[PDB]
Design a binder for this molecule. Structure first.
Ligand SMILES: O=C(O)c1ccnc2cc([C@@H](OCCN3CCCCC3)c3ccccc3Cl)[nH]c12
Ligand SMILES: [Mn+2]
Length: 309
């Protein structure tokens, strides 16, 4: 009955020499990592970038996420107004997030096992008897309050010991983003995610089947699921069979806004799925056309960007 965790995706711990160039390292791990869709990369222990966002002015209105909204399609009074609108700071969002999780599980937030949050998340997504609603500070542009990484744009002070991170190839602002094309001759910044427990992102691939790289600056883990690109059509077939019929005729760009699916459903239909808990200071790389989804274990802060090889 309970959720069965998928097998773990690969985790790499590159040496300082291997960590010098990200594209070179990603190219070398590709024979394994492209067979799992996602992989996790732990930087050397001494690689600890500062957090460079404008914290005092960081303000946002997160999106409301009803975990069982797809199951609820199977109408409620005054639907469309089920939640009051609240703006947060980083501090007040974290206070709300910690209070939600500790109240939900009746224990301190860091004492909740990651396996329990995972099992509860997937139970709540399919539950009609229990309507859990959370909030996600998603798709916050790094242009609003700055990137989480230090950047030498003369908009924020950079200490001397922080300059190496402003210049690092693993700084998401220094990843290559310009795709080659003939139109580029005739004629892209990172996004931020402030998570709370159960906030989530559903199955999707990137525009132009791009790679993506994801960094968890701080907080509780982000739980990932990934499908290798050689099974992309298998996943899409399972979606065609079991996703809500009302959304069946929708293009992929719109379908991937809403369509959540339990990883066990994909696995029972022969789709390979891998998981990982991305912890603070760790990278997750998604490979071209690798479907991925996930949810946050608690209050955290992530940064993501598509990159080109
Ligand atoms: O939250 C994470 O850590 C996370 C990790 C990896 N990939 C994604 C993708 C999303 C989101 O894409 C929303 C779409 N915007 C994307 C960038 C700005 C423009 C349009 C998303 C997709 C489905 C459901 C919810 C969410 Cl927030 N979140 C992700
Ligand atoms: Mn993505």
């Amino acid at each position: 009955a309970e959720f069965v965790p998928p097998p773990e995706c690969p985790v790499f711990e590159p040496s300082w020499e291997e960590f010098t160039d990200p594209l070179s390292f990603i190219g070398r791990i590709r024979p394994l990592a492209e067979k799992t869709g996602i992989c996790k990369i732990r930087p050397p222990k001494d690689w600890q970038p500062p957090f460079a966002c404008e914290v005092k002015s960081f303000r946002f209105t997160p999106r409301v996420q009803r975990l069982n909204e797809l199951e609820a399609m199977t109408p409620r009074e005054a639907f469309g107004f089920e939640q009051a609108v609240r703006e947060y700071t980083l501090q007040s969002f974290g206070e709300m997030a910690d209070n939600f999780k500790s109240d939900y599980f009746n224990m301190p937030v860091h004492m909740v096992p990651t396996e329990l949050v995972e099992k509860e998340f997937w139970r709540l997504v399919s539950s009609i008897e229990e309507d859990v609603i959370v909030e996600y500070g998603a798709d916050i542009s790094s242009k609003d309050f700055g990137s989480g990484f230090p950047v030498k744009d003369g908009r924020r002070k950079i200490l001397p010991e922080e300059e190496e991170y402003a210049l690092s190839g693993w700084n998401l602002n220094n990843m290559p983003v310009l795709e080659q094309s003939v139109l580029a001759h005739i004629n892209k910044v990172p996004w931020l995610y402030v998570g709370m427990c159960f906030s989530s992102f559903c199955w999707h691939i990137e525009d132009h089947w791009s790679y993506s790289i994801n960094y968890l600056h701080w907080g509780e883990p982000k739980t990932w699921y990934g499908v290798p690109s050689h099974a992309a059509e298998q996943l899409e077939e399972v979606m065609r069979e079991l996703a809500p019929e009302l959304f069946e005729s929708q293009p992929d760009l719109l379908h991937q806004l809403v369509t959540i699916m339990n990883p066990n459903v994909l696995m029972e239909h022969g789709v390979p799925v891998y998981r990982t808990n991305q912890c603070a200071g760790e990278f997750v790389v998604t490979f071209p056309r690798a479907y991925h989804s996930g949810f946050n274990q608690g209050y955290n802060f992530a940064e993501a960007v598509n990159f080109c090889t």
